[PDB]
Amino acid sequence: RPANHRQLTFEEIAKSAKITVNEVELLVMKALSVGLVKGSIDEVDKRVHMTWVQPRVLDLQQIKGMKDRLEFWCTDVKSMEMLVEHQAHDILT
Amino acid sequence: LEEGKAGSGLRQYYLSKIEELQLIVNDKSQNLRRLQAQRNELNAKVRLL
Amino acid sequence: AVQKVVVHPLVLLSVVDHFNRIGKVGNQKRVVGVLLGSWQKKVLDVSNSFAVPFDEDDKDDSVWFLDHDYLENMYGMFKKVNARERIVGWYHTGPKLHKNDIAINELMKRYCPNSVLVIIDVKPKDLGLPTEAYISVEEVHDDGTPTSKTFEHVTSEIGAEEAEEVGVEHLLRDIKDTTVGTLSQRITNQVHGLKGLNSKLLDIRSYLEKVATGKLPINHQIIYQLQDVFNLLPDVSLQEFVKAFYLKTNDQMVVVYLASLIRSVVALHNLINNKIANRDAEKKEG
Amino acid sequence: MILDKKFHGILDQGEGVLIIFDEPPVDKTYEAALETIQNMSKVVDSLYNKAKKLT
Amino acid sequence: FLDTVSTFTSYELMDYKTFVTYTVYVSMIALERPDLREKVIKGAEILEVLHSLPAVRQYLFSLYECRYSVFFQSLAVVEQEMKKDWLFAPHYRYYVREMRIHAYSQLLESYRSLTLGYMAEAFGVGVEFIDQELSRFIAAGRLHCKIDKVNEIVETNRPDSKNWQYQETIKKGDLLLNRVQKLSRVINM
Amino acid sequence: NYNKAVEEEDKMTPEQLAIKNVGKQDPKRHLEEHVDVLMTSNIVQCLAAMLDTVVFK
Amino acid sequence: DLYSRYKKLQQELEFLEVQEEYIKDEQKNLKKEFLHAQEEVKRIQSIPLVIGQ
Amino acid sequence: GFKQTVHKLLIVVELLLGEIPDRLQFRQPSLKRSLMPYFLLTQAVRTGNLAKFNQVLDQFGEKFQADGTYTLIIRLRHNVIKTGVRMISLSYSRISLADIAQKLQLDSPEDAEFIVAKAIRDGVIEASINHEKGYVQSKEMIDIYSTREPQLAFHQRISFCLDIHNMSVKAMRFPPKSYNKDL
Amino acid sequence: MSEKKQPVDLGLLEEDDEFEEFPAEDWAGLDEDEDAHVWEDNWDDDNVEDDFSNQLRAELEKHGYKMETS
């Protein structure tokens, strides 16, 4: 999930790793000890917030989604350029 | 009749109001060209510098 | 080793001379010039350069023609008249990096020290910076491919020290200086979207083309860092930055009070002289 | 000592909650307010010169 | 009254003890804690003249000490002495209210939330009177933000620094806006 | 600080302007410098839309 | 002459109206030249210099 | 001499909202004598005593009630309780059945919450209607927009103030043109 | 127009003809204690003054009796 409330909870980690709730702190502590993730969570109730990570293998749905979000960013920057520059060039030049 | 004095009369009065709009454009050209003479005289003054 | 380089416009105007002394023959190939500079300091500073007759073959790309006697004679006389600058590298005017450039650069890697490579465009239609410093160093690859010459992009800047700024400014008489204020800022704020639009739009099309229609590994490993950094800004909800909008908007309010108050101070002399001058000139005119 | 303003803090009786905060940008509202107060005399004096020359 | 060092017994207008007795009201009420600590508490003049009457020392150390249990018991002498004076009687209504709101702002300054028990025991008065007191001092007094009684506890917020410190100039911005509208009225006429 | 540092003299200007009104003796204009100060102050306004574009897309 | 003053005057309407964008060009360009020459005479003043009395 | 009508009607329509600003910054012996009969009632609005001030109005009321059709004063006679309950909105949250109901000269459970609800349906105040044990509570949050959506709060303030000050900039650009027009 | 002020000034002349110097002197009994005083503060002092004119004017002498009873 790149966007749309990336914030998560320990229920998915404990459910996918069939581990108890007492060992998830040592699990994320080892995850931060390896150095592949820099995630620091300011939570009060148990939550899992993550940061920069590298796939390093492959992702085709992220290639197609990369084209979708990339084309969306490009057409939004183009839309703002035509919008601001449209009347801005006519009134200021 | 009563057109050249009334119809063309109010048309001529509207032409006088058009002369008032050309008096606003006229004196705007006058003061804008006098300020243009001020900036031209100052930039020409530093050109003399 | 080298973090940044400095390229003076004199060598690029010498490329204008490369396009001037052609003679209308119909070749206009990638004429290679002998780049000169100061390799002593960590930063690279190009002062001037010269050229050498360079001709390739139509079909075979591996054909390249250089000269050692002309290089040692032009460099010997140039060192005799100015010994503060020595050989550093070369540069070609071709827009595309050919395979033969490893053999062309290899000669100045053997005889001369590590040469920097600069790719420019034959037509000044590219809005981006025409100069790209490509260092000729061999790098170890993680995939296991054999070690080969790699051209890493080194940042470059176009600056003049003492006189070329004056000569360019006198020859142009059209360009403007920094001139902080309305025009120099709003022009950048208008055309900047096209300055990024032509680059990104010009790159991601051939990029997306080489995604599906690509082979001969293009270093797909760096694409993971590409999309990674692109996904390092996952559409922040702006919840925490609201107070920052209150700070920047409060500074906006400060500019509002400064503009209204200061302009209200400027209205003094105008809204006084308009009366005291008109009524006195009118009452004293006749 | 909070009434003496020796440090940042505030007491409480019902809940006993302690809160510590500060306001660094003090030099903005002072200079702005002084510019407003000083410009009031400018506009008022302008209305005195124009009110004198007109009526 | 800062030049009280050079003052002396002047039988022409007012005695020295009457001058101190008259300036102790404007100094005791018209000044805050830093102004008193800087002017009078640091000065030795009130330290010399406090030995004449022991009441003034009680009205200074009790007010500066924030002890309302004795200040309200002894405030009746300030009430009766405040009136029946030549020049000081017609202003007796302003000193009372101004001193009460000044003390309420003094105690309420360093206190964010306040229960009715510690307040009633501190002031030594019933809650039925402070109810209408603060009720009248929210709109009439205009000292702090709105007060709530959902838990029967005096709880204020006072966001008067961060945003209101910048919003103190909007009044001069609106009055200056009407003044430059008058400047627009001067145009052509 | 420069704006107020000139306004402290602009408080004294309406006295001379309220006394003589004839001739100019001070070579300082007190106007174009403040115009330039406003031009330097408009960078916040011109770049606020830039931050709006960077935050938007 | 009476009715000809309208259409004859329209030529003066166009001749005076055409000066608007012209004085716009002059007032927008001559101040750019004013800051050009202003910065040109400003950059003449250099820091390295001799101090007299 | 003429502003006593726009000022008189001004304060007459201002006391309807519960907050009546009197004559503070203007010193002239015309609005004083004009306001002398109206001063007792315009001061009696805030305290809001129904039975006494109802007789006080018609007691000495000659000119302000002889002005015609007694429309806004016959609306004020029942607006006293609305400005008073608006002062209650400026007062504490909890509403008692004896203390504040007896204080407001209205001692009954139905019309208390009924008329207070008639003050809630206006929209000028903020309250939280909750019924747990029979008492009517209210949150009465009158906290200003400080650190509560400020950009949307004073956004229109910045736009409008820059529009008025900017047309004032036009009002300091055009008169110089009307100055240099003749020379 | 400035010509409509005449009947309003006539109404002011009628108000002045109702009582001849009666409100000037009777109100001057308080104005002699209000003269030269800032009238901005007289709105609050007159607000609480007229508010307490009916009952509990001083009330400070009664707190000493209200301490033990409340």
**Which residue carries 């801005």 as its tokens?**
A88
Cβ atoms of F7 and C265 within 8 Å: the answer is yes
Spatial neighbors of C93 by CB under 8 A, at least 6 apart, are C15, C18, C30, C31, C33, C120, C121, C122
Is residue A48 classed as helix, strand or coil in its secondary structure?
A: strand
Cβ atoms of G36 and B39 within 8 Å: the answer is no
- Report the alpha-carbon distance of residue G5 to residue G8 in Å, rounded: 5
**In this complex, do C265 and D42 lie within 8 Å of one another by their Cβ atoms?**
yes
**In this complex, do C264 and E176 lie within 8 Å of one another by their Cβ atoms?**
yes
Cβ atoms of F45 and C252 within 8 Å: the answer is yes
- Residue C119 bridge partners (DSSP): C92
- Report the alpha-carbon distance of residue E67 to residue H101 in Å, rounded: 35
DSSP secondary structure letter of residue E40: I
Cβ contacts from C onto F, under 8 A:
54
CA distance C268 to chain D (A): 7
- Report the alpha-carbon distance of residue H21 to residue H9 in Å, rounded: 13
Considering all CA atoms of chain F, what is the largest pairwise distance in Å, rounded to the nearest integer?
59
Q: Residue-wise over E101-115: b if at least 16 C-beta within 10 A, else e?
A: bbbbebebbebbbbb
Cβ atoms of C89 and C108 within 8 Å: the answer is yes
Spatial neighbors of H25 by CB under 8 A, at least 6 apart, are I39, I40
Cβ atoms of A50 and A30 within 8 Å: the answer is no
DSSP secondary structure letter of residue H17: G
Residue type, E2: L
Is residue A92 classed as helix, strand or coil in its secondary structure?
A: coil
- Residue H138 bridge partners (DSSP): none
Cβ contacts from C onto E, under 8 A:
13
H48 → chain I, closest CA residue: I51
**In this complex, do E169 and C271 lie within 8 Å of one another by their Cβ atoms?**
no
Cβ atoms of D19 and E160 within 8 Å: the answer is no
CA distance B19 to chain H (A): 16
Interface residue E173 vs chain H (CB under 8 A): yes
**Which residue carries 């919003």 as its tokens?**
E167
Which of E145, E164, E163 has its CA nearest to residue E155? E145
Cβ atoms of C102 and C90 within 8 Å: the answer is no
Residues of F in contact with D48 (CB under 8 A): 14, 18
Which of C116, C123, C114 has its CA nearest to residue C94? C123
Q: Which two tokens stand for residue A66?
A: 């990369």
**Which residue carries 């009177």 as its tokens?**
E129
Cβ atoms of H128 and H141 within 8 Å: the answer is no
Is residue H183 classed as helix, strand or coil in its secondary structure?
A: coil
Residues of F in contact with D45 (CB under 8 A): 14, 18
DSSP secondary structure letter of residue F33: H
Q: Which two tokens stand for residue B20?
A: 């008032």
CA distance A32 to chain F (A): 30
Is residue H81 classed as helix, strand or coil in its secondary structure?
A: helix
Residues of C in contact with E183 (CB under 8 A): 264, 267, 271
Q: Which two tokens stand for residue A78?
A: 């183009």
SS3 of chain I: CCCCHHHHHHHHHHHHHHCCCHHHHHCHHHHHHHCCCCCCHHHHHHHHHHHHCCCCCCCHHHHHHHHHHC
Measured distance between the N- and C-terminal CA atoms of chain I, rounded to whole angstroms: 65
**In this complex, do H2 and I27 lie within 8 Å of one another by their Cβ atoms?**
no
Q: Which two tokens stand for residue G42?
A: 């400003």
DSSP E strands in chain H: the ranges are: none
- Report the alpha-carbon distance of residue F30 to residue F35 in Å, rounded: 9
Q: What residues 1-55 of chain D have any CB closer than 8 A to a CB of chain C?
A: 28, 32, 35-36, 39, 42-43, 46, 49-50, 53-54
Alpha carbon distances (Å) from E20 to C103, E38, E40, E49: 103, 18, 12, 8
F4 → chain D, closest CA residue: D35
CA distance E50 to chain D (A): 24
Between CA I37 and CA I45, with CA I41 as vertex, the angle to 5 degrees is 105
Residues of F in contact with A73 (CB under 8 A): 57
Is residue D7 classed as helix, strand or coil in its secondary structure?
A: coil
Residue among H94, H150, H171 whose CB faces E149 most closely: H94
Cβ atoms of H128 and H137 within 8 Å: the answer is yes
**Which residue carries 């229920």 as its tokens?**
A11
- Report the alpha-carbon distance of residue C242 to residue H151 in Å, rounded: 8
Domain map (residue ranges) of chain I: 7-63
Contacts 24+ apart (CB under 8 A), C66-70: C66/C32, C66/C104, C66/C107, C68/C111
- Residue E153 bridge partners (DSSP): E115
Cβ atoms of G14 and B23 within 8 Å: the answer is no
Tell me the backbone φ, ψ of residue D13, rounded to 5 degrees.
Answer: -110, -40
Between CA E52 and CA E56, with CA E53 as vertex, the angle to 5 degrees is 125
CA distance H182 to chain B (A): 7
- Report the alpha-carbon distance of residue H17 to residue C90 in Å, rounded: 84
Describe the crossing of helices I41-52 and E92-109 by its angle, rounded to 10 degrees: 100
CA distance F44 to chain C (A): 7
Per-position DSSP letters for E91-135, written without gaps between them = THHHHHHHHHHHHHHHHHHSBSEEEHHHHHHHHTS-HHHHHHHHH
Cβ atoms of C154 and C116 within 8 Å: the answer is yes
Residues of F in contact with C265 (CB under 8 A): 7, 10, 34
Tell me the backbone φ, ψ of residue E97, rounded to 5 degrees.
Answer: -65, -45
Cβ atoms of G33 and B43 within 8 Å: the answer is yes
- Report the alpha-carbon distance of residue F37 to residue F31 in Å, rounded: 10
Neighbours of chain B (3+ CB pairs under 8 A): G, H
How many residues appear in chain B?
Answer: 49
Tell me the backbone φ, ψ of residue C216, rounded to 5 degrees.
Answer: 55, 75
CA distance E104 to chain D (A): 13
DSSP secondary structure letter of residue F24: -
DSSP secondary structure letter of residue E90: T
Q: Do chain D and E touch: 3 or more Cβ pairs under 8 angstroms?
A: yes
Is residue E89 classed as helix, strand or coil in its secondary structure?
A: coil
Q: Do chain E and C touch: 3 or more Cβ pairs under 8 angstroms?
A: yes
- Report the alpha-carbon distance of residue C105 to residue B10 in Å, rounded: 87
**In this complex, do C272 and F42 lie within 8 Å of one another by their Cβ atoms?**
no
Spatial neighbors of C141 by CB under 8 A, at least 6 apart, are C147
Q: Which residue intervals of F1-57 are DSSP H helices?
A: 2-10, 13-16, 32-56
CA distance C187 to chain H (A): 23
Q: What residues 1-57 of chain F have any CB closer than 8 A to a CB of chain D?
A: 1, 3-4, 7-8, 10-11, 14, 17-18
Measured distance between the N- and C-terminal CA atoms of chain D, rounded to whole angstroms: 58
- Residue E114 bridge partners (DSSP): E154
Interface residue A92 vs chain C (CB under 8 A): yes
User: What method was applied to determine this entry?
Assistant: cryo-EM
**In this complex, do D38 and F1 lie within 8 Å of one another by their Cβ atoms?**
no
Per-position DSSP letters for chain C, written without gaps between them = ---EEEE-HHHHHHHHHHTTTT-S-S-----EEEEEEB-SSSSEEE--EEE------SS-SS-----SHHHHHHHHHHHHH-TT-EEEEEEE--SS--TTHHHHHHHHHHSSSS-EEEB--SSTT--S-S--EEEEEE---TT-PPP-EEEEEEEEEE---SSHHHHHHHHHSSS----TTTHHHHHHHHHHHHHHHHHHHHHHHHHHHHHHS--S---THHHHHHHHHHTTS-----STTHHHHHHHHHHHHHHHHHHHHHHHHHHHHHHHHHHHHHHHHHHTT-
Tell me the backbone φ, ψ of residue I17, rounded to 5 degrees.
Answer: -85, -15
